Design a binder for this molecule. Structure first.
Ligand SMILES: [Zn+2]
Ligand SMILES: [Zn+2]
Ligand SMILES: [Zn+2]
Lengths: 385, 50, 457, 66, 87, 201
C-alpha cells in the first residue's frame, strides 16, 4: 500500500529520458523553475521623506522554525539589511523601531536615522524571549501620539512585522480605522506565513499594502517592494521648509588650534555625550557637533546635506525601460554596448530610445546599480534643449 | 585636431617627453614643502581634561 | 637539524647569489632581458615605488626626503623595504652632492630599465633575432602535453619508473644534487632525501636552481647568458622561429638548449634545431609559492571527516604512489580510499621527519577543488598527529664524541664550560651535574685548554 | 678540568628519567647516560644515537603493549 | 509629577540645577518641558497588559488561574487582578 | 593575493588639446598620453596579475581605448585566461611587448578619435558621466570573470584636463553615489580649471 505509495512519489521524479542523457532535463526544469517577478514599477505621485514605524510581533509564533531556527532569525537578520538598504536608498526618512512583547508595545528605538543605533538595537533584539501575545492597539497608540506631533508635511507610514497570530488587543481597533484614516497615517503589515482578515481588512481600509510571507527569498521581495517610497494617498502635503544647509568645519580656519576640543558644554552644538574637535555647523543654532545629515534638537530644523539625500530619490523616479529580443542584429561586432561581450541567451537588451544592445549583466547593473541607461547619455545631452 | 593627429602615433616626440629633471626638482619641492608643515601647536590639548 | 632553505629562497635567488658575487659580475646581470627579472622576484610595494621616480630622477634626491617619505606608520616596513633594495647593489649612496648624502640608482640599470619602459628597438626588442611565427606547424596544447609528460619523466624517474628516462647526464647532476644519489654498482637513480622534498614541492624554480647550479660544477660558460636565457624563456609561448634561436645563438645557448628539451621546456625537432619553443608553464617559476594555478589536476573535494582519510576519485598512479608511501594496509576498490592509521602514516614520516605543513599542503593537494565549498580548516586531528611526530623527532636528535670523568671542584668546572661554548663545540652547559659536551672536531683545542687549566692549578 | 664530550638530547622529563632505564637495560656497559639532572639535559656516548632515533620508539611501544 | 523627578536621576540632575542655580521654577518646569510626553511617557502605566481588557488576557485567564495553594501575587496583575478587571 | 585592476579615465578635449597647441606648449597631447600610457604600464609593472582600463572622452563618444574594439583585439582579448590560440600577439611579452601590445591600440584609436573633428552637435564637450559607467559595467563582468579566491581590487583614475561640460547634474552625482555602493577608489588629477563638483565626487 504505502510502502509502494511512498516510493510511487520517487518512480516518476527519478526517472527521465533514458538511454543516453539521463538526469539532464531534471536540471532544465530547475532552470525553468526560476525567473520570478521582476519589477512591475512605473509609478508617480507620492513617496518622499517617510517616517516609518517598525512594529514587531513578539509572540509564541517565533518558536516555530518554518524558515530558520527562529522566525525572528528569519526576521531580525534581514531587517539590518533592510535598514542599511533603506538608508542606502532613502536617507530623507527615519524609522520608529517599536516592539510588541507581552500584550504591550515598547518603542525600542526612537524615530531616527542613525543606523548603528538601529542595528545594535537589532543586535540587542537577538535574545528576545517574545513572551506573551501581540497587541497592536498599544502599538498604534505609540504610533498615533508620536506621529500626532509630527507635521502634516510628513509621510506617515507604518511597517508591521506580524506573526499572523490572534490580534490580541481590546478597545475597538476597528474604530481605529476612522481614527487613522482621518489622521492620514498609513499602516502596512505583512503576515508571517498566514493571514489575519481583520488586519487584511485593516490594510485594505488603510491603503497600506498587506502581504503574506511565503519564503525567505519571498520575504526579501516585499521588503524590497517596500524599500521604495510608495505613492500613498493624495492630499498629504506639497512642501517642507527651512531645510538647513550646514557647513563642514575644519577647526583650522583662521585661529589654528585655539580650542583643544570643540565640545565643552558651552559651544553651540556639542549635542551628544562625547568629545569632538569641530567638524560640522548648522545655520540656525549655529550648532557644531558630530556630523549628521538629518536634523537637530535646538534649531530643530532639518540638517539637510544635499549630495546625499537630495540626490538619492532625485534619480529614483525618472526611469524608463528596455526591451528584450532573441534576434540577431549583431550590433557591435557581436558585442555589448556596455560590457562588450557575448553569450547569446537570446536576451538582446535594447533601449527604448537610444536603442543600445545590452546583456543581463548590463541590464541588472542598470536596473539594480546604475538605474539609467548611459546610452541615453551621448544621445540626450548632445541635442538637449 | 589634424595637426597632432600624426604627432601622437609616431611617439618619437613621445619618446622623450620624460627627461626634464628641471621639472623634477620643483615637482620634488612642493612634495617636500607639504612633507613638512611646521609651527602649529602640536600639543593642542592637555588642558582639555580640566 | 634538517635543511629548510633548499625549498623556497625566492628573493635571495636574486640577492644571496647576486650579493654573493661581485658588482661587476652583477653588472653582467644588467642585460636588458634581466631588467624584468629585478622588479618581480622582489615583492615589496614600498621599494616598488622608490624605483618609479628614477626614470624621471636623473638627479640624486636627498636621502632624508625619502627616509621621511613615510611617517610614523610602518617605519620598520619602510626600513625593511630600504636596505634590501640597497642590498641589491642597485643604488649608489652619493657623498655630498649638495651638502649631504643623497641616494641614487645605478644608471646603467636605469639605461637598461628605461628601454624596457618606453621606446627602444634594441637587440632584445628587435633588429637581430628575437622571435618568429611564420606559419603554424605545431600547436601549444599538444606541446602542453609535452609540458606535462616531461615533468612526469622527471618526477616519476625520481621515484623510479617501470618505464625509462631519456639519455641525460642530468641524473649525474641530480645524484650530485643530493636530491638523488646512486651507489657505485649499476648507479641506481634513487632519492637521497631532497628530491622527496622536491616531490613535495611543485614549481620549476628548484630545477632553475640546479640550472643555476648547472654551471657551478666546474663549467665555464655564460652564467650571464643562461640567466638572460632564463628570462628569455619567460615569454609565455606562441613562437616557433625561423630557427630564430640559432640566429640569436651562442655556445651554451644551443648546447644547454639540448637540455631544455631534456628539461622539456623547449621542444626541439630533427637535428635539435630549425625552430625553438617556449612552453606555456613558465608562470609557476616566478610565483614560488602554493598558488591557485598550481593545481596540476583537478580531482575533486576531499575530507578527512572522522579522521578516516575519507575520499575517492580514481586518479593516476602517481597519486596512488603519493599514497603508496602514505596509505596501504586496508586499501580498497576503485575510488582510492585507503583507511586511516594513527601509527603507520605516523611511521610513514619517520623516514622523512615531520611533514607538518606538507600534510597541510597535501591536504589542499589531495583532491584539489576541495576549498571550493568546504570550511577553511577541515582537520583538527591530522595537525595533532603531525605535532606528536614533531616531539618524537625532537627526542631523536643526534651528534658524535667520547667521555671523560672526575671533574672534582665546582668552581673549576664552570670555567671549562666557557671554553667549548666560545669555540662552538658545546651546545649547552650541564652545570649542576658537571657534564660537558665537546665534538671530536675540536678535540685538540679543548684538550690544550684542559692541560693549561691543570698547569694553572 | 675534563674534556668529557657527549650528545645533548632535550626531551620532557618523562623520557629523561627513561634513558636511565635504557642505560640499565643497555646490552653494552653504560655509555648513554654518564649522569642526570632536574633540567631536561643528558649526555650520551655517540655510538648508536642514530639507532636510538628508532631504538627507543620501537621499545616503548612494545613495553606498553603488554 | 514628583515621582517622575525622583525615579529618573538623570532628568533629576537636569531638574537640580534649575533649583540649584535657580534657573527656572517648577511651575515653569512643567510648563514648557513635558507637554507631549503627557501622552507618550504616561502610556506605560495606563496600558499594562492592554487595558480595557477584552480579548488579550481572556485567552489566558483560565489556564493561568492556578499554579498551587499559594502561587499568586506575582507583580501587579500577576494572576488575579484582570479577573477583577472584567466582572 | 588579489588581481589588482586599474581604471583610468583620461580627459581628451581636442578643443582644449587644440587649445593646448594654441599656446604652442612645451607639453602637448602627444606628451600627455604617453606618460599616461606608461602610467598604465606602471600598474602592470607591479604584478603580472595587474589589469588596465583606459577610456578617453571624445565629443561624440567614449570608445574603450583599452582593452580594444578592433580586429587586433576583437579576436584576441588578451593572453592570460581564455586563450584565443593566437600566435603573433600571443607570443612576445614580458614588461615591454605587453606595452606595444597596448601602445598601438590607443594611438590607432585616438587616430579614430582625432579623425572626427566634424562636430556639429553644439559643442558636445566632456562627457565624463556616461563615460564613467562604461568601465563600471565592464568590471562588473570582470567581477564575474573570476572571483574565486580572486578579490577584484579595481581602482579608478580620472584625469581632467579641461572644463566640465553642461551635462545632467543628477547624472553627474548619481554614479558616484553608485560608486559609493561599488566600493572602488576614484582619484582625480585636473590640469586647467578646478571642478568643485568633481572634487565633491
Ligand atoms: Zn537654531
Ligand atoms: Zn550587456
Ligand atoms: Zn540609453
Amino acid at each position: 500500500r504505502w510502502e509502494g505509495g511512498y516510493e510511487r512519489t520517487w518512480e516518476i521524479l527519478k526517472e527521465d529520458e533514458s538511454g543516453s542523457l539521463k538526469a539532464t532535463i531534471e536540471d532544465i526544469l530547475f532552470k525553468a523553475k526560476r525567473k520570478r517577478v521582476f519589477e512591475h514599477h512605473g509609478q508617480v505621485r507620492l513617496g518622499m521623506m517617510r517616517h516609518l514605524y517598525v512594529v514587531v510581533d513578539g509572540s509564541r509564533t517565533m518558536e516555530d522554525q518554518d524558515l530558520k531556527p527562529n522566525r525572528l532569525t528569519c526576521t531580525l537578520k534581514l531587517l539590518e539589511y533592510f535598514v542599511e538598504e533603506y538608508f542606502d536608498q532613502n536617507p530623507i526618512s527615519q524609522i520608529g523601531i517599536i516592539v510588541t512583547k507581552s500584550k504591550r508595545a515598547e518603542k525600542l528605538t526612537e524615530l531616527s536615522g542613525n543606523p548603528r543605533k538601529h542595528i545594535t538595537s537589532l543586535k540587542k533584539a537577538v535574545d528576545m524571549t517574545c513572551h506573551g501575545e501581540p497587541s497592536l492597539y498599544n502599538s498604534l497608540s505609540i504610533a498615533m501620539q508620536t506621529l500626532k506631533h509630527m507635521p502634516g508635511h510628513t509621510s506617515r507610514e507604518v511597517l508591521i512585522i506580524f506573526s499572523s497570530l490572534t490580534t490580541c488587543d481590546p478597545s475597538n481597533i476597528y474604530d481605529l480605522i476612522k481614527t487613522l484614516k482621518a489622521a492620514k497615517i498609513r499602516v502596512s503589515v505583512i503576515g508571517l506565513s498566514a493571514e489575519v482578515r481583520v488586519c487584511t481588512v485593516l490594510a485594505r481600509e488603510t491603503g497600506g499594502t498587506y502581504h503574506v510571507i511565503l519564503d525567505e527569498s519571498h520575504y526579501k521581495e516585499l521588503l524590497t517592494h517596500h524599500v521604495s517610497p510608495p505613492p500613498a494617498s493624495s492630499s498629504s502635503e506639497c512642501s517642507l521648509i527651512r531645510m538647513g544647509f550646514p557647513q563642514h568645519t575644519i577647526a583650522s580656519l583662521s585661529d589654528q588650534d585655539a580650542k583643544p576640543s570643540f565640545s565643552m558644554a558651552h559651544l553651540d552644538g556639542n549635542t551628544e555625550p562625547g568629545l569632538t574637535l569641530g567638524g560640522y555647523f548648522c545655520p540656525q543654532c549655529r550648532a557644531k557637533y558630530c556630523e549628521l545629515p538629518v536634523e537637530c534638537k535646538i534649531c530643530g530644523l532639518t540638517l539637510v546635506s544635499a549630495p546625499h539625500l537630495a540626490r538619492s530619490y532625485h534619480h529614483l523616479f525618472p526611469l524608463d525601460a528596455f526591451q528584450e529580443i532573441p534576434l540577431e542584429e549583431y550590433n557591435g561586432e557581436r558585442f555589448c554596448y556596455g560590457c562588450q561581450g557575448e553569450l547569446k541567451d537570446q536576451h538582446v537588451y535594447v533601449c527604448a530610445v537610444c536603442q543600445n544592445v545590452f546583456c543581463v549583466d548590463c541590464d541588472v547593473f542598470v536596473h539594480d546599480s546604475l538605474h539609467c541607461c548611459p546610452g541615453c547619455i551621448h544621445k540626450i545631452p548632445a541635442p538637449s534643449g | 585636431i589634424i595637426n597632432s593627429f600624426q604627432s601622437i602615433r609616431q611617439e618619437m616626440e613621445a619618446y622623450t617627453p620624460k627627461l626634464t629633471q628641471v621639472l623634477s626638482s620643483s615637482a620634488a619641492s612642493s612634495t617636500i614643502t607639504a612633507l613638512s608643515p611646521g609651527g602649529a601647536l602640536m600639543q593642542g590639548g592637555t588642558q582639555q581634561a580640566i | 637539524s634538517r635543511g629548510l632553505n633548499r625549498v623556497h629562497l625566492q628573493c635571495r635567488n636574486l640577492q644571496e647569489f647576486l650579493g654573493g658575487l661581485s658588482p661587476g659580475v652583477l653588472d653582467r646581470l644588467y642585460g636588458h632581458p634581466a631588467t624584468c627579472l629585478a622588479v618581480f622576484r622582489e615583492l615589496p610595494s614600498l621599494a616598488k615605488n622608490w624605483v618609479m621616480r628614477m626614470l624621471f630622477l636623473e638627479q640624486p634626491l636627498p636621502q632624508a626626503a625619502v627616509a621621511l617619505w613615510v611617517k610614523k606608520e610602518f617605519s620598520k616596513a619602510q626600513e625593511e623595504s630600504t636596505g634590501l633594495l640597497s642590498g641589491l647593489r642597485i643604488w649608489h649612496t652619493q657623498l655630498l652632492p649638495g651638502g649631504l648624502q643623497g641616494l641614487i640608482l645605478n644608471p646603467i640599470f636605469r639605461q637598461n630599465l628605461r628601454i624596457a619602459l618606453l621606446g627602444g628597438g634594441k637587440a632584445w626588442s628587435d633588429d637581430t633575432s628575437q622571435l618568429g611565427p611564420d606559419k603554424h606547424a605545431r600547436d601549444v596544447p599538444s606541446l602542453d602535453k609535452y609540458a606535462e609528460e616531461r615533468w612526469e619523466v622527471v618526477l616519476h624517474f625520481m621515484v623510479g619508473s617501470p618505464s625509462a628516462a631519456v639519455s641525460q647526464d642530468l641524473a649525474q647532476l641530480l645524484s650530485q644534487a643530493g636530491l638523488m644519489k646512486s651507489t657505485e654498482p649499476g648507479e641506481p637513480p634513487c632519492i637521497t632525501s631532497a628530491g622527496f622534498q622536491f616531490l613535495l614541492l611543485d614549481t620549476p624554480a628548484q630545477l632553475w636552481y640546479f640550472m643555476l647550479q648547472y654551471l657551478q660544477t666546474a663549467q665555464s660558460r655564460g652564467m650571464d647568458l643562461v640567466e638572460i636565457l632564463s628570462f628569455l624563456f619567460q615569454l609565455s609561448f606562441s613562437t616557433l622561429g625561423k630557427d630564430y634561436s640559432v640566429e640569436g645563438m651562442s655556445d651554451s645557448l644551443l648546447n644547454f638548449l639540448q637540455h631544455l628539451r631534456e628539461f622539456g621546456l623547449v621542444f626541439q625537432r630533427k637535428r635539435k634545431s630549425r625552430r625553438y619553443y617556449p612552453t606555456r608553464l613558465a608562470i609557476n617559476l616566478s610565483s614560488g609559492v602554493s598558488g591557485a594555478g598550481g593545481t596540476v589536476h583537478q580531482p575533486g573535494f576531499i575530507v578527512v571527516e572522522t579522521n578516516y582519510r575519507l575520499y575517492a576519485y580514481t586518479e593516476s598512479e602517481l597519486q596512488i604512489a603519493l599514497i603508496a608511501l602514505f596509505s596501504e594496509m586496508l586499501y580498497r576498490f576503485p575510488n582510492m580510499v585507503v583507511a586511516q592509521v594513527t601509527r603507520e602514516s605516523v611511521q610513514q614520516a619517520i623516514a622523512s621527519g615531520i611533514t607538518a605543513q606538507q600534510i597541510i599542503h597535501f591536504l589542499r593537494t589531495r583532491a584539489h577543488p576541495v576549498m571550493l565549498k568546504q570550511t577553511p580548516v577541515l582537520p583538527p586531528t591530522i595537525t595533532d598527529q603531525i605535532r606528536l611526530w614533531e616531539l618524537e623527532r625532537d627526542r631523536l636528535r643526534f651528534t658524535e664524541g667520547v667521555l671523560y670523568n672526575q671533574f672534582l671542584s665546582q668552581v673549576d668546572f664552570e670555567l671549562l664550560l666557557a671554553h667549548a661554548r666560545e669555540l662552538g663545540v658545546l651546545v649547552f652547559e650541564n652545570s649542576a651535574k658537571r657534564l660537558m659536551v665537546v665534538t671530536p672536531a675540536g678535540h685538540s683545542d679543548v684538550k690544550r685548554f684542559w692541560k693549561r687549566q691543570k698547569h694553572s692549578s | 678540568v675534563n674534556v668529557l664530550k657527549g650528545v645533548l638530547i632535550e626531551c620532557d622529563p618523562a623520557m629523561k628519567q627513561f634513558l636511565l632505564y635504557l642505560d640499565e637495560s643497555n646490552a653494552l656497559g653504560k655509555k648513554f647516560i654518564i649522569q642526570d639532572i632536574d633540567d631536561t639535559h643528558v649526555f650520551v656516548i655517540a655510538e648508536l644515537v642514530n639507532v636510538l632515533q628508532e631504538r627507543v620508539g620501537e621499545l616503548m611501544d612494545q613495553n606498553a603493549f603488554s | 509629577k514628583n515621582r517622575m523627578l525622583q525615579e529618573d536621576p538623570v532628568l533629576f540632575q537636569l531638574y537640580k540645577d534649575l533649583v540649584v542655580s535657580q534657573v527656572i521654577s517648577a511651575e515653569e518646569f512643567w510648563a514648557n518641558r513635558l507637554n507631549v510626553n503627557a501622552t507618550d511617557s504616561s502610556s506605560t502605566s495606563n496600558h499594562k497588559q492592554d487595558v480595557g481588557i477584552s480579548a488579550a488576557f481572556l485567552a489566558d485567564v483560565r489556564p493561568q488561574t492556578d499554579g498551587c495553594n499559594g502561587l499568586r501575587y506575582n507583580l501587579t496583575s500577576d494572576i488575579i487582578e484582570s479577573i477583577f478587571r472584567t466582572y | 593575493d588579489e588581481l589588482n585592476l586599474l581604471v583610468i579615465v583620461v580627459d581628451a578635449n581636442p578643443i582644449w588639446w587644440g587649445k593646448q597647441a594654441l599656446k604652442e606648449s612645451q607639453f602637448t597631447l602627444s606628451k600627455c598620453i604617453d606618460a599616461v600610457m606608461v602610467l598604465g604600464n606602471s600598474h602592470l609593472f607591479m604584478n603580472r596579475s595587474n589589469k588596465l582600463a583606459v577610456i578617453a572622452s571624445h565629443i561624440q563618444e567614449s570608445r574603450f581605448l583599452y582593452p580594444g574594439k578592433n580586429g587586433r583585439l576583437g579576436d584576441f582579448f588578451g593572453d592570460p585566461g581564455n586563450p584565443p590560440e593566437f600566435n603573433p600577439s600571443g607570443s612576445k611579452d614580458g614588461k615591454y611587448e605587453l606595452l606595444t601590445s597596448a601602445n598601438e591600440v590607443i594611438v590607432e584609436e585616438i587616430k579614430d578619435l582625432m579623425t572626427k573633428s566634424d562636430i556639429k552637435g553644439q559643442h558636445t564637450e566632456t562627457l565624463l558621466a556616461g563615460s564613467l559607467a562604461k568601465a563600471l559595467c565592464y568590471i562588473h563582468r570582470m567581477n564575474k570573470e573570476v572571483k574565486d579566491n580572486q578579490e577584484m581590487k579595481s581602482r579608478i583614475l580620472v584625469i581632467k584636463a579641461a572644463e566640465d561640460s553642461a551635462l545632467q547634474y543628477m547624472n553627474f552625482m548619481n554614479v558616484i553615489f553608485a560608486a559609493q555602493k561599488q566600493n572602488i577608489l576614484i582619484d582625480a588629477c585636473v590640469l586647467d580649471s578646478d571642478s568643485g563638483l568633481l572634487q565633491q565626487a
